[PDB]
Amino acid sequence: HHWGYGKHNGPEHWHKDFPIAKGERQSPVDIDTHTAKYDPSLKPLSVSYDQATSLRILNNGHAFNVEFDDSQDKAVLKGGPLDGTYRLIQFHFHWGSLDGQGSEHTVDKKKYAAELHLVHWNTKYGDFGKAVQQPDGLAVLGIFLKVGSAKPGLQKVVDVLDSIKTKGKSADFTNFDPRGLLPESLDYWTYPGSLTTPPLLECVTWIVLKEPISVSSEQVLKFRKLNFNGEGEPEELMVDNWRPAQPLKNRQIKASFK
Ligand SMILES: N=C(N)c1ccc2nc(-c3cc(CC(=O)N[C@@H](CC(=O)O)C(=O)O)cc(-c4cc(S(N)(=O)=O)ccc4O)c3O)[nH]c2c1
Ligand SMILES: [Zn+2]
Numbered sequence: 001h002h003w004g005y006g007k008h009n010g011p012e013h014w015h016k017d018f019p020i021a022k023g024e025r026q027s028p029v030d031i032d033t034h035t036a037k038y039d040p041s042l043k044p045l046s047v048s049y050d051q052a053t054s055l056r057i058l059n060n061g062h063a064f065n066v067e068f069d070d071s072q073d074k075a076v077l078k079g080g081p082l083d084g085t086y087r088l089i090q091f092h093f094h095w096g097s098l099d100g101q102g103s104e105h106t107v108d109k110k111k112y113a114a115e116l117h118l119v120h121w122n123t124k125y126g127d128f129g130k131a132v133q134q135p136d137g138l139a140v141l142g143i144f145l146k147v148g149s150a151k152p153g154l155q156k157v158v159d160v161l162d163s164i165k166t167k168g169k170s171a172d173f174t175n176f177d178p179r180g181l182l183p184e185s186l187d188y189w190t191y192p193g194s195l196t197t198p199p200l201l202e203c204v205t206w207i208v209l210k211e212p213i214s215v216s217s218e219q220v221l222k223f224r225k226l227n228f229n230g231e232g233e234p235e236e237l238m239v240d241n242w243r244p245a246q247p248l249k250n251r252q253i254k255a256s257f258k
Contacts, residue, residue, distance in 0.1 A: 027193030028104035086120035153180020
């Protein structure tokens, strides 16, 4: 009876195995654009993905992860609210059964069709496992998806999903350039929060881009053909793998832009 997004194991039940689900810095949150304050001391964000080395794509039963080689300082996030250097380890998405829901963060209560999470860990803790035990251990760059024009840089991801339909399947996924998933502008909101899946650890500085990327209806329809279940198990479409917005509590959301 493992956690998930179904009628009996979804986010309302997580607190029973992971009591930090009711904690002081949980994610995602609603971003109230009229309450977020412009912070002119935020530095420009530095996204350095030219040497990023993708390795593999895995259906983990909750999402799919595109995994990177993080054994050296290649693909790094720095600047903005961050102190020091954060190394790219994986990206994944959260998405809906229909275009009107799917994102984890919301903007003035607007839900986007999906949300990309590029996950980075703070190199001063030496490995990912140590980093998640620290309040400043991870930096997650969140990017909204809306349905419109295709994203050309996403199609190589869409075209491998058929080969990782079910839980536990993986495929070689080398030479993928995550620069192709970014919007034009790096304007962002930031706040301290958590992983949005169990174990819900409170180790994340969230950096949420204001500008969504456009993907096509055909591209997200292929996400929604994935399965939560393992091979030879009853088919459960991988849809609605998002956690809803959590209380803000004693937190401020800061904007990088006027
Ligand atoms: N590249 C590798 N060698 C490697 C090895 C192990 C790894 N474990 C994870 C991982 C696990 C986890 C969970 C974790 O802590 N432990 C797991 C498994 C376990 O340790 O028993 C669990 O309890 O389910 C989360 C993330 C991750 C998830 C999100 S979100 N939006 O909440 O889905 C955001 C950022 C995240 O970092 C993970 O990245 N990423 C890993 C990468
Ligand atoms: Zn995520």
